[PDB]
Amino acid sequence: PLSATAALRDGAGQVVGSARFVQQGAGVQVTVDVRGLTPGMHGMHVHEFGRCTPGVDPAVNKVVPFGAAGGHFDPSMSRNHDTPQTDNKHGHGGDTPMLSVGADGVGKASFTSTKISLTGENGILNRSLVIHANPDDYKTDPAGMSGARERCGVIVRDGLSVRDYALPGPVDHPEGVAYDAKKGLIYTGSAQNGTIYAINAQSGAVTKFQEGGAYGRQVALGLKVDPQGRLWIAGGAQGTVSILTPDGMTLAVLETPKSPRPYINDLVLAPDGNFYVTDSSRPVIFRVDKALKLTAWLDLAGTPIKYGPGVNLNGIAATPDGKYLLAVQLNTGELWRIDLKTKAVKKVMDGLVNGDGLLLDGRTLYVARNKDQVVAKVSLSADYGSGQLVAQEPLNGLRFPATLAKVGNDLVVTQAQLDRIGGTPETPFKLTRFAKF
Ligand SMILES: [Ca+2]
Ligand SMILES: [Cl-]
Ligand SMILES: [Cu+2]
Ligand SMILES: [Zn+2]
């Protein structure tokens, strides 16, 4: 059972109440218990950002209490304030019913809403609940004349500890992530401009490992660190695989064949010492041997993997017994097993639509499902010929999770917001570290 809690605080930071969110179906059972308010009806809404600090209110363009919570949660971008009964396509998903405060200054509420969820596109984990000074006329934009923000609490997933690493840029869109255990460095790359950030896993300190923009370095997708500490970078529509030295210098840019519509997506270093590289547009798997010789290792046109619209093969892993590759086809949601010795291809399972980055830990496979805003967990059979979906974790809210890396006994996932590229992402961009579940 998914559940979350917001400790509601006043302007001075004192805890004055709490709201509880419990998943029931596709909606949420909400209870609010707060004291110390003025009696009457108070606007109450789920706001887009999980920040109960001052920030700019667009109505006056000045900093206001709880302004950093942003506007009302608006998963459909309706940009229209309406009733708690309006479908999200026409009104803010965060438009919840007003809080009634009795004469003793205590507010209680208990309602169910299908406009919000703890998972998926309507998910409100790491968003916020704001109680206002005035009543909500459920009509006037942007907030129904609810006026000043009087109480606010960040919605936090119950029973789960996570750690965020925040990035500095306005369009970072971190896509790939990798980890140098000897250096204690997390690397993450920008899908937008190719910059590689370095993150000290212990302190959280962020630096630029290498600025993007040069040949083979305009886009950075899937990332891996090899035993020598070199960073391998899938190059997207550049059609390249690029390699950086531990010092941050470009060692090589490797080209794939100049056939139309390249999209080099992700990669993995198998126990055999070879890298295997997915292309989500062209039906081919590339291999880069220890000699940095890149070949078109498997033509998928003969196999049962059929390419279609959107992203095809993308996340990829190698079984630690050296026998297979596993690769997820995002658009069909199929997980494929590829025999490294014979190049035979076998469907493992389906049910993984929007499956993106893979992370294999023995017979446990973690799968970011980007549009679904979860990390799925799959249990595989010993021959890797079949699997079962055992859990889907929204953690504490994931805005388009893309790829995964092992950091000690933890995992780290990028919140890529790739569905907002060219649009209006939330800032800061962040990576999220969490225990294997
Ligand atoms: Ca990917
Ligand atoms: Cl208002
Ligand atoms: Cu509000
Ligand atoms: Zn609204």
DSSP letter, residue 117:
B
The alpha carbon of 22 and the centre of ligand 1 are apart by a number of angstroms equal to 32
The alpha carbon of 47 and the centre of ligand 3 are apart by a number of angstroms equal to 6
128-132, strands of its sheet edge to edge:
40-42, 99-101, 107-113, 27-34, 15-24, 3-9, 149-157, 128-132, 44-47
The alpha carbon of 142 and the centre of ligand 2 are apart by a number of angstroms equal to 6
Residues whose CB falls within 8 Å of the CB of residue 389, separated by 6 or more in sequence, listed in order = 349, 351, 352, 376, 377, 378
CB atoms within 10 A of CB 371: 16
Report the distance separating Cα 432 and Cα 394, nearest Å.
11
Helix, strand or coil, per DSSP, at residue 415: strand
Residues 384, 386, 388, 393, CA torsion sign: positive
Burial (Cβ within 10 Å: 0-12, 13-18, ≥19) of residue 170:
exposed
Report the distance separating Cα 164 and Cα 185, nearest Å.
15
DSSP annotation string for 172-238: --EEEEEEETTTTEEEEEETTT--EEEEETTT--EEEEE-S-STT-S---SEEE-TTSPEEEE-BTT
**CB-CB contact of 10 with 150 (8 Å):** yes
Ligand nearest to the CA of 72: 4
**CB-CB contact of 8 with 151 (8 Å):** yes
What is the Cβ-side half-sphere exposure of residue 407, based on CA atoms within 13 angstroms?
29
Report the distance separating Cα 105 and Cα 340, nearest Å.
68
The alpha carbon of 92 and the centre of ligand 4 are apart by a number of angstroms equal to 5
Helix-strand-coil split of the chain, %, nearest 5: 5, 45, 50
The alpha carbon of 125 and the centre of ligand 1 are apart by a number of angstroms equal to 24
CATH of 3-157 among 2.60.40.200, 3.40.190.10, 3.10.20.30, 1.20.120.1200: 2.60.40.200
The alpha carbon of 296 and the centre of ligand 3 are apart by a number of angstroms equal to 54
Q: In the CATH hierarchy, which fold is given to the domain comprising 162-435? A: Neuraminidase (2.120.10)
Burial (Cβ within 10 Å: 0-12, 13-18, ≥19) of residue 260:
exposed
Ligand nearest to the CA of 66: 3
Residues 58, 421, 224, 245: what is their CA dihedral angle, to the nearest 10 degrees?
-80
Ligand nearest to the CA of 59: 2
- Which technique was the structure solved with, according to the deposited record? X-ray
The alpha carbon of 265 and the centre of ligand 1 are apart by a number of angstroms equal to 5
DSSP letter, residue 120:
G
Element (H, E) at 113: strand 107-113
Beta bridge partners of residue 218, listed in sequence order = none
Helix, strand or coil, per DSSP, at residue 420: helix
Q: Where are the domains of the chain?
A: 3-157, 162-435
Ligand nearest to the CA of 153: 3
The alpha carbon of 371 and the centre of ligand 1 are apart by a number of angstroms equal to 12
Ligand nearest to the CA of 138: 4
Report the distance separating Cα 379 and Cα 402, nearest Å.
20
The alpha carbon of 136 and the centre of ligand 4 are apart by a number of angstroms equal to 9
Ligand nearest to the CA of 73: 4
Report the distance separating Cα 412 and Cα 225, nearest Å.
14
The alpha carbon of 13 and the centre of ligand 1 are apart by a number of angstroms equal to 41
Ligand nearest to the CA of 146: 2
The alpha carbon of 224 and the centre of ligand 4 are apart by a number of angstroms equal to 42
Ligand nearest to the CA of 144: 2
Report the distance separating Cα 378 and Cα 231, nearest Å.
28
Report the distance separating Cα 51 and Cα 153, nearest Å.
8
Report the distance separating Cα 273 and Cα 227, nearest Å.
10
Report the distance separating Cα 284 and Cα 280, nearest Å.
9
Residues whose CB falls within 8 Å of the CB of residue 281, separated by 6 or more in sequence, listed in order = 261, 262, 263, 307, 312
The alpha carbon of 1 and the centre of ligand 1 are apart by a number of angstroms equal to 29
Q: What are the structure tokens assigned to 260, written together?
A: 């139309």
Mark the residues whose beta carbon lies below 5 A from ion ligand 4. Answer: 72, 81, 92, 95
> In whole angstroms, how far apart are CA 194 and each of 122, 208, 350, 383, 405?
30, 11, 32, 38, 19
> In whole angstroms, how far apart are CA 244 and each of 55, 158, 216, 249, 330?
39, 40, 11, 5, 28
The alpha carbon of 135 and the centre of ligand 2 are apart by a number of angstroms equal to 10
Helix, strand or coil, per DSSP, at residue 121: helix
The three-state DSSP-derived secondary structure of 233-267 is: EECECCCEEEEECCCCCEEEEEECCCCCCCCEEEE
DSSP letter, residue 37:
P
Of 221, 182, 279, 163, the C-alpha closest to 421 is 221
Helix, strand or coil, per DSSP, at residue 69: helix
∠ at Cα 12 (8, 17), nearest 5°?
Answer: 20
Report the distance separating Cα 400 and Cα 402, nearest Å.
6
Resolution in A: 1.9
Helix, strand or coil, per DSSP, at residue 431: strand
Ligand nearest to the CA of 314: 1
Of 241, 248, 306, 228, the C-alpha closest to 276 is 241
Report the distance separating Cα 289 and Cα 306, nearest Å.
26
Of 75, 70, 27, the C-alpha closest to 399 is 75
